[PDB]
Design an enzyme around this catalytic site. Structure first.
Site, PDB file in Angstrom:
ATOM      1  N   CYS A  28      -7.001   1.087  -0.030  1.00  0.00           N
ATOM      2  CA  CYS A  28      -7.575   2.383  -0.649  1.00  0.00           C
ATOM      3  C   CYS A  28      -7.299   2.482  -2.092  1.00  0.00           C
ATOM      4  CB  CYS A  28      -7.108   3.511   0.474  1.00  0.00           C
ATOM      5  SG  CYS A  28      -5.412   3.783   0.297  1.00  0.00           S
ATOM      6  N   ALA A  31      -3.279   2.721  -2.596  1.00  0.00           N
ATOM      7  CA  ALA A  31      -2.736   1.432  -2.528  1.00  0.00           C
ATOM      8  C   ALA A  31      -2.712   1.081  -3.995  1.00  0.00           C
ATOM      9  CB  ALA A  31      -3.156   0.532  -1.474  1.00  0.00           C
ATOM     10  N   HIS A  35      -6.810   1.270  -9.561  1.00  0.00           N
ATOM     11  CA  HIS A  35      -6.498   0.748 -10.750  1.00  0.00           C
ATOM     12  C   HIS A  35      -7.009   1.536 -11.898  1.00  0.00           C
ATOM     13  CE1 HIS A  35      -6.501  -3.381  -8.486  1.00  0.00           C
ATOM     14  NE2 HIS A  35      -5.338  -2.604  -8.327  1.00  0.00           N
ATOM     15  N   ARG A  68       5.759  -4.625  -1.206  1.00  0.00           N
ATOM     16  CA  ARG A  68       5.223  -5.385  -2.319  1.00  0.00           C
ATOM     17  C   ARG A  68       6.339  -5.873  -3.050  1.00  0.00           C
ATOM     18  NH1 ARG A  68       2.454  -4.035  -7.624  1.00  0.00           N
ATOM     19  NH2 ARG A  68       1.107  -5.530  -8.066  1.00  0.00           N
TER      20      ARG A  68
HETATM   21  S1  CLF Z   1      -7.154   6.146   2.761  1.00  0.00           S
HETATM   22 FE1  CLF Z   1      -5.152   5.449   1.674  1.00  0.00          FE
HETATM   23  S2  CLF Z   1      -3.537   4.976   3.188  1.00  0.00           S
HETATM   24 FE2  CLF Z   1      -5.148   6.250   4.555  1.00  0.00          FE
HETATM   25  S3  CLF Z   1      -4.332   8.407   4.518  1.00  0.00           S
HETATM   26 FE3  CLF Z   1      -5.944   7.956   2.619  1.00  0.00          FE
HETATM   27  S4  CLF Z   1      -4.450   7.566   1.094  1.00  0.00           S
HETATM   28 FE4  CLF Z   1      -3.268   7.339   2.745  1.00  0.00          FE
HETATM   29 FE5  CLF Z   1      -1.063   7.599   5.226  1.00  0.00          FE
HETATM   30  S5  CLF Z   1      -1.109  10.006   6.462  1.00  0.00           S
HETATM   31 FE6  CLF Z   1      -1.883   8.139   7.979  1.00  0.00          FE
HETATM   32  S6  CLF Z   1      -2.000   6.363   6.867  1.00  0.00           S
HETATM   33 FE7  CLF Z   1      -3.954   7.631   6.658  1.00  0.00          FE
HETATM   34  S7  CLF Z   1      -3.876   8.705   8.708  1.00  0.00           S
HETATM   35 FE8  CLF Z   1      -3.078  10.629   7.288  1.00  0.00          FE
END
Ligand code: CLF
Ligand code: ICS
Ligand code: CLF
Ligand SMILES: [Fe+3]
Ligand SMILES: [Fe+3]
EC number: 1.18.6.1
Lengths: 522, 477, 522, 477
Positions: free
Chosen positions: B59, B62, B192, B93
């Site tokens: 996402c 990340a 990015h 990472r």
């Molecule tokens: S697409 Fe990216 S990783 Fe996904 S939530 Fe969104 S920013 Fe995060 Fe963190 S808390 Fe858990 S993992 Fe998600 S469902 Fe709610």
């Protein structure tokens, strides 16, 4: 520079003089780093009690938490069923993170899909994404059933899973007969274990709510076992084994041990074992249902008592000596099967190990953290061993659980100097182990950094970490270990006593200084 | 070779999918033709993933917190929102750094707002201000704070920009708000872009009026090297041995002061084009600083990059470059003589995020190894333009490949060694084909430069020729 | 001085300033100790290669041996039979030492008696002692059978056990029908494993030599299993379990696991389990006899092939992948039972663990020591893992065993830099690990002192010890571990990889110095 | 309690044995009567064990090498003969020392001749000489060698005294031949006697003509303290806080120079009478040095011993004794106040070797605990003469008890605590009665003196009141 016959990785090849000079030049020239004396004084200040008061006055900032979000537990619960695809309704980054987390813990493939909702779904919802994703998943990976959970995006938007799946079935995207259980798993409520509870409750509802007319309690002469959020495969194995030696018919619900321990023989198995749909449909016909981790399966207990009409026993986690005994006698009473000689012999062998190691075990001080049920089981077992718990931390705990833990602690003189912390993170625990130093910690891999910090204060202030819990990222194959029952108690006792002995051996290894106590026999 | 059988394999793999998914995924698989420089006519990239197909993509959070902002050691990064996102990305990472963690360095630490239901319902700007105050109290040596957005903040309407402005004026501190919510974009690439824009808007211009820094004609800045297992370090030494002064390092082992000093350098050496092209172009337009891409993967690419970089400077720098090349020649020659005989002729299929699927090809060829298939999670079409000329004729190219597609392609091609992420490692190990993690270097490395080349060869040899791969079939089966 | 709330044992209470001053005064006043610089120079000299040549020129002096004497192995063999009293014909000090040794290893009661021969018997023999001892033992401790071994005193004097026991039966001291097998176990020949072999051979002779007329090979449709000198109870358990899943009728000979792992439930059991006399008498009727540790059961093999007419297979110790596979296929061929799916799955899981840990396992250098069969099995497994053996030591090894080990080493490129040493002790090994430093040692508790010595040279020169073998005195409950089969291979692999990871974590724990490589994930 | 009940128990336990064994073992069990001063009339000791009754006794080699000679750190002790004896006794006794093992200290090391069949047949004197040469080459800082005899050397016609003489003359080194073969005597006591005679004949008189050592009127020598867990150290500090100079301790943390200096002291404080009475008497006859027995087990015995030792010296020594007693009074008072309430009224049964079965009674009584049964492995009738007055009325006394006898006595008496060795520990733990190792202090300690008293109380409390002892019965049985 590298020597071809002895090539060095990052450690220790960055300890070469040229790299040291380069790093010193970089820091002195461009990093504008604080002076080393300032850094040392700040560190020493953070080791103090005044810093601990400031740390414990926190109300908005969380530092290094000891929990996860609900959909991770929902995925773990879904993986325990035969040919079932975990399906997370929401954004794909969550699925990538869940898969990486479980891959690093189990060192195994972990299968899960997402419908990849975007800003367009943030405006209009994710109904079309649900339809297309269910169709694509069924066509491509061919599961027998799809279990649907949600990310925080779908929860905040307000997507109605039931209506979306009903419209998917109505418009022919997937067959009407195909089982698609669902559960809402908001990440801002509870933790991963709550997600496990929600997933299991929704699955059981889907398979039993509308078919209770012909169900009779005790018809199939079996006992249902619900493990909850479980990351030790030995736990499933020992539960099944103990139920097997007793001759007790059992139906274990959400069994992921097969799919998480597949052999490496030249083929990739995406599905393996797991609880079948027939078992889920026949569950209301059991004599009773036993919940192994009652403190994060309250919704499941409510559903099981309200609908299946099962008198769920008030049982603790069968950890340590007394609680394993209570679990065995309760199972014997429910099933009518006597406890066999093999279990009695195993209990006696555990008691023998306890008597053998009691001298080294006695009076040792432990900080510990993890999930509520596991933490209370380990605290009970440590009290049985004559150990003194001092700092007990549970980030995802609640007040009633804290009250029960305090009641357990009051019943033993070894719990006199113990404090229970709920809602605290590992920065709080770092302060606690600096200000009230225990002998060891017991927790997951994130504790290692705490260990490092203590070494920075001094060798005499170091608190070694003992790796029990979830997740374990810096050691291999510890997920195969056993924690529940007599076998789990034996493993925990061996780990504890041998960690104590290795620490003592390290402290007495200096020749002509401390090696007078480097005894061959201990 | 045999392009036609590769197209037949592609169609056979495509047969399983539904109609719409079939036609979408058909455009993302291709047979390479080195003569083609316009990859848009051949492959489509940077599009949304098909729901329910088990993509590898991440996402935008990340991309921003995990990749760009996170490596900065002296700044505290708050994963603003629910607890999961910071927890799953903490220390995942291997962005290496030197510092005292918890005092003046905070990379491996997880700061989060730990959102609860009341925060969802009633907003979390006041909680953000309180968190900023607590961070100031408990971490006095911090030199800046970033606020990385997760999905609920974008969904509920929180104004983190105003909070950042007021608190930064109040405490005289740099507070950078990043709208890096995960539902934006389709992968880490928009992460990015958003992180680069935040750097430009809130950090980069803080020393425009400051002229106290003494500059030299040999000042350079390393951009887009994130010090994976020390990779950036092994690059800098080479650049330091050539006589250049490395002022800034984006963002491996990076400090906010280095980012502030970056507009004072004479040249920007960009390693990861995909993540840092935005800020490189912006620096070119605003300060006139030229940038150039370089490759330190393998001795051949390292020599070419060193000579090309030295060509931008005077004669003394070129002489120093030749001296460095001569000094390091025997080491990598010995490495090749030791390891190439065990690696010659083996075939590799690669699938990584946005730079490495074409950057590491030269190092593999230096050991006599052939790349037969490659692909990207989130590359753009210019990345594929750069990729086509470096891949062999009629080799397989895949964009945002699904798990089923990847498994079918591997089962047909039968490569000797696969390089990908942690989410394919165990799948492909169970099928009996050696696997190397090409994101984290399988907790090994570094791989950049001459020192990293030896580690690269040793790791490839240890995994490809391990005896364990001969034992998967039981003698009675 | 002691504080009542925090009382200190020897360590670290002898680190108090008053005790340090007292010790300094004692050394400076009355010990006439060599100067510290002289001691340091001598130590450094003993770490050098010239000292290694002088050490390896030894012909008469043995320093810290890695073996024991025969009667210890004879007692271990005797304890594996039902209601059997080990009886050592000789002096009582040997029995006291044997009992203390096994008590410290197993942390369990070890029962053995002696006839307490004295200086009087040194000129008349121990016939009267034998008569009275057999009578008293039978009357007091009520065994079903008495197994007689000898100390070096009886061997040098030349007592004839057969005639002594026959005269005991003739004079009515014990009944004629009471089984009293015997074996000569000279301590100046071989080692403890030789004593085990002699004890077992004499017992089998006593129970089968004079009744072979009615024996038919393969009548009882079973396979005889002879373990040899074995100090891991998990080994007996895994052998029985593997034979059980295969559906193969088996007769385990000399099973001591029951008597060495009795429960602690309020009563003391002197005898428990063990091979019955009926099984020993019926052994010649088996299909075949498999010897688990062929390199110290040669006399047993000669007796079994010569008298029972069993074609004893040429099988290695079932340690590690290839040899476990060969053992399983040979058992399948002999019994006619196919290898089931469970064993195949277990093998696949072991291979999966190998693939998971190969990156950390590869290229690591090990010194190792122990008994011949165990040493060769561990060397084979280490070669299978891609590890490099360097120093292989076996004090009780012979030239043929060394030739076979060299043949094993030649078949793998990872054995290129390996040397096999027979007749060498742990002082030789200390020299070897100083001059050609490996990454780790694998051996019993006596290796810890070697580890200490390396730490004295420096942190960079330390070679950590890994405790696999016999005896293990400074850790608790390691005697419950498993070494044979796929489960034993899994345990060994986990121990090795996690020892490597703990060493790496310790080396990278220095803040701002080496902690850049203190990764969370490995 | 109930004398006639104890006699009935003795006869009932006796019924099992054969007539000869019954008759012999009847003399070795007795009911204590404190008025009795001559113990020969009630109990017989120092006789041969009955064959095959599972006695606990050791051999003469254990008495000589294991107990007396082994603790000497700067001398190398060769277990001459087969390999077993040195191996089973290596580092089994916690005789603590300060030194660099392998350079100038060799206590935890096992030196042996490793006898083989050719040595049995053709003798091993030449092998002994070669071994001595090798020891000289490989351990240059050694300050002496002893040769401890095992069984075959006594059996075969080997003459180690001549070899020791020739080699000691050749290398100008002290070589002590000890004829400590295991078949001599009936227990470790003859080992003690033989080791004492060897010390007298070969080591003690080496500085008779030397008068360079400066002597003081307060010079004392500790005899019969083997520094078990540091016990001797915790004694010495008290004696040096008292104002006395401790020249030598035999043989805990001992050096050959200290043994040579022993004939220069003014008083010999003997802790273990059983093992060192021979050398103490010899020193009294030859040098005129008086000796006295003392007890440092528990505060009462420690204070009594300190005052009695003070009475041997002038007024300043007595004043310092009172100062030490006053200084240490609060510590052991606090220890008693903490631990006696948890230990008051408990009953103890003890079985050890030659000295501790009566020495540790006072410390147990200091914590309010009652000793109901005691016995010795190898002690002589004078030790029982002391024990009769040290023990309570109608308590059980046993000499060279068998395993069956010990188990039956424990099963009838049902003590709260048992003190014995490693060969009874697990037997009695399985029956559910707490056990403390009273030879090696259960790898804890030290117990001597005021510092050791706290450890003693803590250990007894931890084992007596451990929760594990409440769990032996399963709830369903
Ligand atoms: S697409 Fe990216 S990783 Fe996904 S939530 Fe969104 S920013 Fe995060 Fe963190 S808390 Fe858990 S993992 Fe998600 S469902 Fe709610
Ligand atoms: S020497 Fe003796 S058996 Fe006096 S052989 Fe034995 S270290 Fe005992 S009762 Mo072990 S006569 Fe010392 C003894 Fe006492 S070894 Fe220790 S504890 S005070
Ligand atoms: S009574 Fe004592 S311990 Fe016994 S032998 Fe004799 S001196 Fe020694 Fe060493 S070698 Fe083994 S244990 Fe004996 S049987 Fe030959
Ligand atoms: Fe795996
Ligand atoms: Fe035990």
């Amino acid at each position: 520079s590298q020597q071809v016959d002895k090539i060095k990785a990052s450690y220790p090849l960055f300890l070469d003089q040229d790299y040291k000079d380069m790093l010193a030049k970089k820091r002195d020239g461009f990093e504008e780093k604080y002076p080393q004396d300032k850094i040392d004084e700040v560190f020493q200040w953070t080791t103090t009690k005044e810093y601990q008061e400031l740390n414990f006055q926190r109300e908005a900032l969380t530092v290094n938490p000891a929990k996860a979000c609900q959909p991770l537990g929902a995925v773990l619960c879904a993986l325990g069923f035969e040919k079932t695809m975990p399906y997370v309704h929401g954004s794909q980054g969550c699925v990538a993170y869940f898969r990486s987390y479980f891959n690093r813990h189990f060192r195994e493939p972990v299968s899960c899909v997402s419908d990849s909702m975007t800003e367009d779904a943030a405006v209009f919802g994710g109904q079309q994404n649900m339809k297309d994703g269910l169709q694509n998943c069924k066509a491509t990976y061919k599961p027998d059933m799809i279990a649907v959970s949600t990310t925080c995006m779908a929860e905040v938007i307000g997507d109605d899973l039931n209506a979306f799946i009903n419209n998917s079935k109505k418009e022919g995207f997937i067959p009407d007969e195909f089982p698609v259980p669902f559960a809402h798993t908001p990440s801002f409520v509870g933790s991963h274990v709550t997600g496990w509870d929600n997933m299991f409750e929704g699955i059981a509802r889907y398979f039993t709510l509308k078919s209770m007319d012909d169900k009779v309690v005790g018809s199939n002469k079996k006992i249902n076992i619900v493990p909850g959020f479980e990351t030790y495969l030995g736990n499933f194995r020992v539960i099944k084994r103990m139920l097997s030696e007793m001759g007790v018919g059992y139906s274990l619900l959400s069994d992921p041990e097969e799919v998480l321990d597949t052999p490496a023989d030249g083929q990739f198995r995406m599905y393996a074992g797991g609880t079948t749909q027939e078992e889920m449909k026949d569950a209301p016909n059991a004599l009773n249902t036993v919940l192994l981790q009652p403190w994060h399966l309250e919704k499941t207990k409510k559903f099981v008592e309200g609908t299946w009409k099962h008198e769920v026993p008030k049982l603790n986690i069968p950890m340590g000596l007394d609680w394993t005994d209570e679990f065995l006698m309760k199972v014997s009473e429910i099933s009518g099967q006597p406890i066999p000689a093999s279990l009695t012999k195993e209990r006696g062998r555990l008691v023998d190990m306890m008597t053998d190691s009691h001298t080294w075990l006695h009076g040792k001080r432990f900080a510990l953290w993890g999930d509520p049920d596991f933490v209370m089981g380990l605290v009970k077992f440590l009290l049985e061993l004559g150990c003194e718990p001092v700092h007990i931390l549970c980030h995802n705990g609640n007040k009633r659980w804290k009250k029960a833990v305090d009641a357990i602690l009051a019943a033993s003189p070894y719990g006199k100097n113990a404090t229970v912390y709920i809602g605290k993170d590992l920065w709080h625990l770092r302060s606690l182990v600096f200000t009230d130093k225990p002998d060891f910690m017991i927790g997951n891999s994130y504790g290692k950094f705490i260990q490092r910090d203590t070494l920075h204060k001094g060798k005499e202030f170091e608190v070694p970490l003992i790796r029990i819990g979830f997740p374990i990222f810096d050691r291999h194959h510890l997920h195969r270990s056993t924690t529940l029952g007599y076998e789990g108690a034996m493993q925990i006792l061996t780990t504890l006593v041998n960690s104590i002995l290795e620490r003592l051996d390290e402290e007495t290894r200096g020749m002509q200084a401390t090696d007078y106590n480097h005894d061959l026999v201990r | 070779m045999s392009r036609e059988e590769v197209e037949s394999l592609i169609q056979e793999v495509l047969e399983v999918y539904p109609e719409k998914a079939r036609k979408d995924r058909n455009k993302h698989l291709a047979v390479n033709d080195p003569a083609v420089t316009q990859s848009k006519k051949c492959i489509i990239s940077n599009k949304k993933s098909q729901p329910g197909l088990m993509t590898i993509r991440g996402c935008a959070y990340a991309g921003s917190k995990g990749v760009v902002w996170g490596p900065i050691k002296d700044m505290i990064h708050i994963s603003h929102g629910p607890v999961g996102c910071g927890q799953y990305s903490r220390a995942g990472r291997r962005n290496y750094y030197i510092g005292t963690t918890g005092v003046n360095a905070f990379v491996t630490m997880n700061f989060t707002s730990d959102f609860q239901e009341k925060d969802i319902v009633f907003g979390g700007d006041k909680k953000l201000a309180k968190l900023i105050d607590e961070v100031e109290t408990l971490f006095p040596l911090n030199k800046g704070i970033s606020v990385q957005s997760e999905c609920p903040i974008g969904l509920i309407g929180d104004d983190i920009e105003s909070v950042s402005k007021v608190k930064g004026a109040e405490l005289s501190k740099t507070i950078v708000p990043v709208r890096c919510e995960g539902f934006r974009g389709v992968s880490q690439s928009l992460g990015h872009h958003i992180a680069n824009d935040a750097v430009r808007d809130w950090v980069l211009g803080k020393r425009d009026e400051d002229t106290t820094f003494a500059s030299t004609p040999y000042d350079v800045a390393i951009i887009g090297d994130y010090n994976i297992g020390g990779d950036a370090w092994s690059s800098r030494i080479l650049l330091e041995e050539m006589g250049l002064r490395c002022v800034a390092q984006w963002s491996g082992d990076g400090s906010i002061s280095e980012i502030e000093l970056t507009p004072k350098v004479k040249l920007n050496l960009v390693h990861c084009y995909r993540s840092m092209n935005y800020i490189s172009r912006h620096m070119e337009e605003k300060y006139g600083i030229p940038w150039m891409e370089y490759n330190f993967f393998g001795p051949t690419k390292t020599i070419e990059s060193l000579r090309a970089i030295a060509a931008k400077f005077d004669e003394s720098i070129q002489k120093k470059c030749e001296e460095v090349i001569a000094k390091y020649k025997p080491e990598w020659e010995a490495v090749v003589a030791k390891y190439r005989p065990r690696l010659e002729g083996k075939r590799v299929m690669l699938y990584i995020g946005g730079l490495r699927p074409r950057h590491v090809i030269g190092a593999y060829e230096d050991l006599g190894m052939e790349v037969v298939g490659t692909g990207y999670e989130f590359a753009h079409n210019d990345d594929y333009d750069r990729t086509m000329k470096e891949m062999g004729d009629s080799t397989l190219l895949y964009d945002d490949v699904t798990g089923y597609e990847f498994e079918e392609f591997v089962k047909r091609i039968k490569p000797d060694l696969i390089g990908s992420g942690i989410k394919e490692k165990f799948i492909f190990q169970k099928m009996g084909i050696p696997f190397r993690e090409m994101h984290s270097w399988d907790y090994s490395g570094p791989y950049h430069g001459f020192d990293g080349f030896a580690i690269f060869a040793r790791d490839m040899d240890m995994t490809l020729n391990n005896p364990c791969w001969k034992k998967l079939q039981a003698p009675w089966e």
